[PDB]
């Protein structure tokens, strides 16, 4: 059936933390990217209508990981969801900074199966410097980025509109510079389940 149904069949597949160890999967995958692991995990559970899929209550340790999730039946998946690690708001100095820079840029630019990126940004504070870097890393691919302005229930109606238009304007600058891939945006609220049908429809458009 629907993209909703397929999403709801989701299950955890594997974790991954080096470029060479990405699963050799046939199917297309979507990447979820963002400063917040909290918001990512919460977005994945709501899109799949599950309580306990995306590691929502797991306490960050010393290391980070990509996580893969079958879409459709786990025995016979029709896609994967790739939760890329939250870069937060400042970058952690140390040998793992380089590692993750190389990994993510090479993944974004050359992972054959990757058909697009969902970029999760707090509506109150869109488009940080690290958000911008994920955009620029994806540039050469000509692949799309859909931006979710998250926690949109915390803004007034006017403020949310203002945020849509501000992000739109920032995204156009990229197109005007020559950015090949399609840049879109919507409001999104995990808590109030806002923007969910639009989020499903976009995903369906990419995967099928
Ligand atoms: Cl978020
Ligand atoms: Cl690490
Ligand atoms: Cl949200």
From Swiss-Prot:
Family annotation (CDD domains): YihA_EngB
Binding site for GTP: 34-41, 61-65, 83-86, 150-153, 187-190
GO MF terms, alphabetically ordered: GTP binding; metal ion binding
InterPro entries: G_ENGB_dom, GTP-bd, GTP-bd_ribosome_bio_YsxC, P-loop_NTPase
Top-rank lineage group of the source organism: Bacteria
Any single biological process term in GO: division septum assembly
Function as written in the Swiss-Prot or TrEMBL entry: Necessary for normal cell division and for the maintenance of normal septation.
Family: Belongs to the TRAFAC class TrmE-Era-EngA-EngB-Septin-like GTPase superfamily. EngB GTPase family.
Protein name, per record: Probable GTP-binding protein EngB
Lineage: Bacteria, Pseudomonadati, Pseudomonadota, Betaproteobacteria, Burkholderiales
């Amino acid at each position: 059936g629907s993209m909703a149904f397929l999403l709801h069949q989701a299950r955890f597949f594997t974790t991954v933390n080096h470029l060479r160890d990405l699963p050799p999967t046939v199917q297309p995958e979507i990447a979820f990217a963002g400063r917040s692991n909290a918001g990512k995990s919460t977005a994945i559970n709501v899109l799949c209508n599950q309580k306990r899929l995306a590691f929502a209550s797991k306490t960050p340790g010393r290391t980070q990981h990509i996580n893969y999730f079958s879409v459709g039946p786990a025995a016979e998946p029709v896609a994967h969801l790739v939760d890329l690690p939250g870069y937060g708001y400042a970058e952690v100095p140390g040998a793992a900074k380089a590692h993750w820079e190389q990994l993510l840029s090479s993944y974004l630019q050359t992972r054959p199966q990757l058909c697009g990126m969902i970029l999760m940004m707090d509506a109150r504070r869109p488009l940080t410097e690290l958000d911008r870097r994920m955009i620029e890393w994806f540039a050469p691919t000509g692949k799309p980025i859909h931006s979710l302005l998250t926690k949109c229930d915390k803004l007034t109606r006017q403020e949310s509109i203002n945020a849509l238009r501000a992000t739109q304007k920032s995204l156009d600058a990229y197109r005007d510079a020559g950015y090949a891939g399609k840049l879109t945006v919507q409001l999104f609220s995990a808590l109030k389940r806002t923007g969910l049908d639009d989020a499903h429809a976009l995903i369906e458009s990419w995967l099928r």
